[PDB]
């Protein structure tokens, strides 16, 4: 129980990071970190690095605080341009230990009708955020993420839907809604609640 708890947290971490491939010579760190916090806090980026020539080495590893995020940074970041390049995104590479929990989370989560969103502005409230979304249906809850420490949210939550339908309309429609005055970044949860 310990050991499969092991297995799972592993498994969670592996989803939370994203890598990120032919970054042009000239950019770095701070231009990644503006292109991939649209869609969840950053908790780290981990540049490539070659200690001799001291360069980045064209890749990089950008690590979400969930897992959702990094979902949503990897059906929609590939082929973007920066810098004048197309940069790549994937998963991490030595993940076979852990892809059978991935793929069970993923078929766990469908049946909480459970929507993520990301880019949320701070002047918007829970309240703002589920009276926009209800038009998709009647959600069971709305919650946006807060820092504790602070009490403001986190620019990203969770909403549960009553009907799956609705899940499924509101994912395809507010992706890249305008509220606030930003792109909302909108995709269905990769896991169960926890």
Same mark, same amino acid.
């Given at each position: 129980?310990?050991?499969?708890?092991?297995?799972? =947290?592993? $498994? +969670?971490?592996? &989803?939370?990071? @994203?890598?990120? %491939?032919?970054?042009?010579?000239?950019? !770095?760190?701070?231009?990644?970190?503006?292109?991939?916090?649209?869609?969840?806090?950053?908790?780290?980026?981990?540049?490539?690095?070659?200690?001799?020539?001291?360069?980045?080495?064209?890749?990089?590893?950008?690590?979400?605080?969930?897992?959702?995020?990094? =979902?949503? $940074? +990897?059906?929609? &970041?590939?082929? @973007?341009?920066? %810098?004048?390049?197309?940069?790549?995104? !994937?998963?991490?590479?030595?993940?076979?230990?852990?892809?059978?929990?991935?793929?069970?989370?993923?078929?766990?989560?469908?049946?909480?009708?459970?929507?993520?969103?990301?880019?949320?502005?701070?002047?918007?409230?829970?309240?703002?955020?589920?009276?926009?979304?209800? $038009?998709?249906?009647?959600?069971?809850?709305?919650?946006?993420?807060?820092?504790?420490?602070?009490?403001?949210?986190?620019?990203?939550?969770?909403?549960?839907?009553?009907?799956?339908?609705?899940?499924?309309?509101?994912?395809?429609?507010?992706?890249?809604?305008?509220?606030?005055?930003?792109?909302?970044?909108?995709?269905?949860?990769?896991?169960?609640?926890?």
């Amino acid at each position: 129980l310990q050991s499969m708890a092991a297995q799972r =947290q592993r $498994a +969670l971490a592996i &989803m939370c990071r @994203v890598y990120v %491939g032919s970054i042009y010579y000239e950019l !770095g760190e701070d231009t990644i970190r503006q292109a991939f916090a649209p869609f969840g806090p950053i908790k780290s980026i981990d540049m490539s690095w070659d200690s001799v020539t001291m360069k980045h080495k064209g890749f990089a590893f950008v690590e979400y605080e969930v897992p959702e995020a990094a =979902q949503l $940074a +990897l059906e929609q &970041m590939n082929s @973007v341009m920066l %810098g004048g390049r197309n940069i790549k995104v !994937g998963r991490p590479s030595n993940i076979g230990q852990a892809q059978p929990i991935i793929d069970q989370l993923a078929e766990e989560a469908r049946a909480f009708n459970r929507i993520y969103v990301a880019s949320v502005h701070q002047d918007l409230s829970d309240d703002d955020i589920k009276s926009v979304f209800e $038009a998709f249906g009647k959600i069971k809850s709305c919650t946006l993420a807060r820092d504790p420490t602070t009490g403001k949210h986190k620019g990203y939550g969770f909403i549960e839907y009553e009907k799956a339908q609705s899940s499924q309309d509101a994912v395809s429609s507010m992706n890249l809604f305008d509220l606030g005055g930003q792109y909302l970044r909108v995709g269905k949860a990769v896991t169960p609640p926890m």
